[PDB]
């Protein structure tokens, strides 16, 4: 009664999953989110909505020799946090930036245990990279980039054909961090929205273009 959380192997050493929701007025809504493997370490960009979906993906990287080394959440809305706190439970490191964490702390939800300040922050030395390029879709939205294969995940600020909720987006400021993120990732080869499908570095011109429209629309009555 709700699809089955999907896992496909996108690159060498990075997989997707998608995991699915519905949503009021949007219909079932898929989440993707990344598993990235250093060696024989695996790292969850970003969690399921689930409890139970979290665990099947640890479940099904672990039975194949896998250890989980980390999680991080690239916002605080819990298509991106939904598993924290079962991973948690299981001792396993979750991370998530400082206003993350205030933002969660906010929304009564269980914070990650370890937390990162400043714009560039290395999970894995080298080989997986966060990224704040200033609020947009939340105020603590963050990018992780994959400097070997040149993967992007966007999370929730990569909204290539429409913007989604404003809820708790800051539109006067999503212009500014769209142009910020074009200018510092042109080199990417897949950049990975959280609500639509992958795609190359035009998404971050088409991201742009839609906080651009998206901050017009709101200053009208
Ligand atoms: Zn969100
Ligand atoms: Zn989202």
Same mark, same amino acid.
């Given at each position: 009664?709700?699809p ?5 192997? @996108? ?9 699915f ?5 949007? +219909?079932?809504?898929? $989440? ?11 790292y969850?960009? %970003? ?17 194949? +020799?896998?250890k989980?080394?980390?999680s991080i959440?690239?916002? !605080? ?5 939904? +598993? ?19 933002? @969660?702390?906010? %929304?009564?939800?269980?914070? *990650? ?38 993967? @992007? !995940? +966007?999370?929730? !600020?990569? $909204? ?15 212009? #500014?961090?769209? $142009? ?6 042109? #080199? *990417? ?10 795609? %190359?570095?035009?998404? @971050? #011109?088409l ?6 429209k998206?901050?017009?629309?709101? #200053?009208?009555?």
């Amino acid at each position: 009664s709700l699809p089955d959380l999907k896992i496909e192997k @996108l690159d060498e050493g990075v997989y997707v999953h998608t995991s699915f929701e519905e949503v009021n007025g949007w +219909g079932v809504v898929p $989440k993707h989110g990344l598993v990235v493997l250093v060696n024989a370490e695996a790292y969850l960009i %970003d969690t399921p909505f689930t409890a139970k979906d979290t665990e099947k993906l640890v479940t099904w990287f672990v039975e194949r +020799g896998y250890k989980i080394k980390g999680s991080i959440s690239s916002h !605080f809305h819990s298509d991106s946090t939904g +598993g924290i706190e079962w991973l948690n439970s299981r001792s396993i490191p979750t991370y998530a930036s400082e206003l993350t964490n205030e933002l @969660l702390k906010k %929304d009564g939800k269980v914070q *990650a245990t370890n937390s990162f300040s400043g714009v560039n922050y290395w999970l894995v030395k080298n080989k997986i990279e966060v990224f704040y390029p200033g609020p947009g879709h939340t105020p603590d939205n963050v990018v992780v980039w994959l400097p070997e294969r040149k993967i @992007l !995940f +966007g999370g929730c !600020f990569i $909204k290539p054909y429409g913007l989604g909720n404003l809820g708790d987006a800051n539109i006067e400021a999503w212009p #500014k961090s769209a $142009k910020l993120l074009k200018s510092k990732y042109g #080199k *990417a080869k897949l950049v990975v929205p959280s609500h639509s499908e992958v795609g %190359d570095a035009s998404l @971050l #011109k088409l991201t742009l273009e839609q906080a651009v429209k998206g901050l017009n629309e709101s #200053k009208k009555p």
